[PDB]
Design an enzyme around this catalytic site. Structure first.
Site, short mmCIF file in Angstrom:
data_model
loop_
_atom_site.label_atom_id
_atom_site.label_comp_id
_atom_site.label_asym_id
_atom_site.label_seq_id
_atom_site.Cartn_x
_atom_site.Cartn_y
_atom_site.Cartn_z
N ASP A 1 44.32 33.00 43.32
CA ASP A 1 43.79 32.66 42.03
C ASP A 1 43.93 31.19 41.72
O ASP A 1 44.99 30.64 41.86
CB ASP A 1 44.42 33.52 40.95
CG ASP A 1 44.38 34.99 41.27
OD1 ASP A 1 45.28 35.50 41.91
OD2 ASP A 1 43.41 35.63 40.90
N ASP B 1 43.75 44.09 37.88
CA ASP B 1 43.78 45.29 38.73
C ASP B 1 43.66 46.59 37.92
O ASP B 1 44.53 47.46 38.00
CB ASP B 1 45.05 45.32 39.56
CG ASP B 1 45.09 46.49 40.53
OD1 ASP B 1 44.04 46.77 41.17
OD2 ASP B 1 46.16 47.14 40.63
N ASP C 1 48.93 43.50 40.51
CA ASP C 1 49.44 42.93 41.75
C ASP C 1 49.06 41.43 41.84
O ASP C 1 49.47 40.73 42.76
CB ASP C 1 48.96 43.73 42.99
CG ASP C 1 47.44 43.94 43.06
OD1 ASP C 1 46.71 43.55 42.13
OD2 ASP C 1 46.99 44.55 44.07
N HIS C 2 48.33 40.92 40.85
CA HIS C 2 48.22 39.47 40.66
C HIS C 2 49.01 39.06 39.42
O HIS C 2 49.17 39.87 38.51
CB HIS C 2 46.77 39.00 40.47
CG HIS C 2 45.88 39.24 41.64
ND1 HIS C 2 45.29 38.21 42.35
CD2 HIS C 2 45.41 40.39 42.20
CE1 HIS C 2 44.54 38.71 43.31
NE2 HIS C 2 44.59 40.04 43.25
N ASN D 1 39.79 34.93 46.07
CA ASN D 1 40.07 35.82 47.19
C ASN D 1 40.12 35.11 48.53
O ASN D 1 39.55 35.56 49.52
CB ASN D 1 39.04 36.95 47.24
CG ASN D 1 39.54 38.14 48.00
OD1 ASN D 1 38.94 38.55 49.00
ND2 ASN D 1 40.67 38.67 47.57
N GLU E 1 38.64 42.15 37.98
CA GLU E 1 38.94 43.53 38.34
C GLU E 1 39.28 44.35 37.10
O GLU E 1 40.30 45.03 37.06
CB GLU E 1 40.07 43.61 39.36
CG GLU E 1 39.57 43.76 40.78
CD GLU E 1 40.65 44.13 41.77
OE1 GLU E 1 41.25 43.23 42.39
OE2 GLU E 1 40.87 45.34 41.97
N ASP F 1 39.76 34.93 40.67
CA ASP F 1 40.25 35.39 41.95
C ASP F 1 39.21 35.02 42.99
O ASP F 1 38.18 35.70 43.11
CB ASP F 1 40.49 36.90 41.89
CG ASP F 1 41.02 37.47 43.18
OD1 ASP F 1 41.17 36.73 44.19
OD2 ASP F 1 41.28 38.69 43.16
N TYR G 1 35.10 36.88 40.28
CA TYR G 1 35.85 37.80 41.11
C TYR G 1 35.11 37.85 42.44
O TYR G 1 34.11 38.54 42.54
CB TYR G 1 35.96 39.19 40.47
CG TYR G 1 36.65 40.20 41.37
CD1 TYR G 1 37.85 39.87 42.00
CD2 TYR G 1 36.11 41.45 41.60
CE1 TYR G 1 38.48 40.77 42.86
CE2 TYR G 1 36.75 42.38 42.44
CZ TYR G 1 37.93 42.02 43.07
OH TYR G 1 38.57 42.92 43.91
MG LIG Z 1 42.88 43.58 43.87
#
Ligand SMILES: [Mg+2]
EC number: 3.1.11.2
Length: 275
Positions: free
Chosen positions: A240, A28, A265-266, A169, A54, A167, A129
């Site tokens: 993830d 992030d 935040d991951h 997502n 990211e 990620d 990502y």
């Molecule tokens: Mg993010």
DNA sequence: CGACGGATCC
DNA sequence: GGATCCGTCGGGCGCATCAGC
DNA sequence: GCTGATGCGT
């Protein structure tokens, strides 16, 4: 509702010692993550390969501390051309890969900075990502078309087994997030993204390493929104993953979720393989 | 996207 | 009438750009 | 150069 990842299992089911440690992390904002001591945690983890998502950082803006990593000296970076400050992925490796490539087919024209492919001696590694469906699902159809192109790209690779990490997502099943029913119309848990994930596993084909080892374990997440102190309450999502070719399952020692590592935040995820 | 308010269902 | 379902709403983060000095 | 506002994505 809180979660404690079990101890690291560094031996395969048949008794073979792990020889390869891979760590994946959506940071992030790479520059922010380094200021919050993310690299100090990487040094402690000491992975053979480190995949980052990211990064939000073009290669010219990489902090100098990244030059000071002797054990991860082979580094590959990708950032989008027309959207710097978003996306961006990186792959850092102890040993030099045989081959590195970027994107899923047309990166030289569609420079998206979402995917790196690295071929090693015994396996191919992809880190990704995956595009977000967005607030109000405004980019869901694009995500669905992307999933299809990605699936076909991974299937279309010219032998060795595959490791896919990053990620992706999406929380595949209800066990993969804290609030399944309230999020069925939200990015990351639509029927469309969940189905795209199932299709990924069947089409390639791939196994979800964590779920394979821990099929019925709840409250294991890798993402928590910065809002409302969600992380302190472990209100999170598993976004993830480490997805493996079926032939790699006997080599699988463990698939970890590093819940305690801060800086994003991951949290990191870590794979141990006996190769 | 979790918290919140308001409706609905045993 | 507690549990559940469902729609709406405010807001933490990082980074780019901009206005001002 | 530096800060803080705003926009964007989420
Ligand atoms: Mg993010």
């Amino acid at each position: 509702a809180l979660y404690e990842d079990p101890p690291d299992q560094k031996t395969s089911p048949s008794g073979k010692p792990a020889t390869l440690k891979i760590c994946s992390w959506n940071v992030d904002g790479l520059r922010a993550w380094i200021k919050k001591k993310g690299l100090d945690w990487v040094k402690e983890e000491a992975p053979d390969i480190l995949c980052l998502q990211e990064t939000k950082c073009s290669e010219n803006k990489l902090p100098a501390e990244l030059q000071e990593l002797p054990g991860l000296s082979h580094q590959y970076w990708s950032a989008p051309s027309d959207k710097e400050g978003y996306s961006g992925v990186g792959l850092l490796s102890r040993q030099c890969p045989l081959k590195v490539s970027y994107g899923i087919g047309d990166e030289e024209h569609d420079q998206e900075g979402r995917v790196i492919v690295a071929e090693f001696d015994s396996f191919v590694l992809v880190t990704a990502y995956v595009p977000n469906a967005g607030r109000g699902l405004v980019r869901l159809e694009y995500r669905q078309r992307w999933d299809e192109a990605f699936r076909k790209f991974l299937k279309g690779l010219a032998r060795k087994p595959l490791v896919l990490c990053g990620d992706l997502n999406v929380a595949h099943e209800e066990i993969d997030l804290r609030n399944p029913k309230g999020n069925k119309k939200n990015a990351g848990f639509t029927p469309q993204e969940r189905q795209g994930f199932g299709e990924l596993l069947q089409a390639v084909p791939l196994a979800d390493s964590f779920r394979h080892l821990y099929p019925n374990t709840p409250y294991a997440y890798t993402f928590w929104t910065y809002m409302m102190n969600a992380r302190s309450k472990n209100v999170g999502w598993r976004l993830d993953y480490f997805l493996l070719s079926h032939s790699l399952l006997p080599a699988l020692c463990d698939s970890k979720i590093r819940s305690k590592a801060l800086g994003s935040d991951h949290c990191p995820i870590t794979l141990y393989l006996a190769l």
